[PDB]
Design a protein around this ligand. Structure first.
Ligand SMILES: Cc1cn([C@H]2C[C@H](OP(=O)(O)O)[C@@H](COP(=O)(O)O)O2)c(=O)[nH]c1=O
Ligand SMILES: [Ca+2]
Length: 136
C-alpha cells in the first residue's frame, strides 16, 4: 500500500533529519524508525558517531539524482510538525543504510508506522554482529 513520491533536497540537518521540498512546500522530515546520535542538543552534548552519521546522510542525499519520500500507514507528521517518512536516495533507503552501517539504532517504533521494522531490525542485527561503529 505504501507509495514513493518525489521530493527535492533543500538541506541535510543531521543524521536523521533533512529538509526537503515536497509538493511545492519546504518541510522538515524526520526519518522513521531510527535514531542517530545527537549533535545539537545541549543536554546530550555531541554524542559519539553523531558527526559521522550526519556526514553519511548528507553525502547520500546530496549526491543523489533522485530523492523519494515514502509515508507509512499512520501519522504523517510528529508533534514538531516534521514529516515522518522513509527516504530513498536513488532507490536506496537512507533509514536502512544508516542502520546497516551501525550509525543508527532502530528506535521510536510507534504502531502502525512500522511497516519496515523487521527489515531494519535485520540490518541492525547484522551491524551488531559485525561490530560496526555504534556496536564496536
Ligand atoms: C522518529 C520519531 C520521533 N518522534 C518524536 C519522539 C521524540 O520526542 P521528544 O523530543 O519529546 O523526546 C522526538 C525524537 O526526535 P529526535 O531524535 O530528532 O530528537 O521526536 C515521534 O513523535 N515520532 C517518530 O516517529
Ligand atoms: Ca536523533
Amino acid at each position: 500500500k505504501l507509495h514513493k513520491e518525489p521530493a527535492t533536497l533543500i538541506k541535510a540537518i543531521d543524521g536523521d533529519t533533512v529538509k526537503l521540498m515536497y509538493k511545492g512546500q519546504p518541510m522538515t522530515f524526520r526519518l522513521l524508525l531510527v535514531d542517530t546520535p545527537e549533535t545539537k542538543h545541549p543536554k546530550k552534548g555531541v554524542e559519539k558517531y553523531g558527526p559521522e552519521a550526519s556526514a553519511f546522510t548528507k553525502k547520500m542525499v546530496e549526491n543523489a539524482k533522485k530523492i523519494e519520500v515514502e509515508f507509512d500507514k499512520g501519522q504523517r507528521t510528529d508533534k514538531y510538525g516534521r514529516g515522518l517518512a522513509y527516504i530513498y536516495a536513488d532507490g536506496k533507503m537512507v533509514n536502512e543504510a544508516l542502520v546497516r552501517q551501525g550509525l543508527a539504532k532502530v528506535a521510536y517504533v510507534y504502531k502502525p508506522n512500522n511497516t519496515h521494522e523487521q527489515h531494519l531490525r535485520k540490518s541492525e542485527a547484522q551491524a551488531k554482529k559485525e561490530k560496526l561503529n555504534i556496536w564496536s
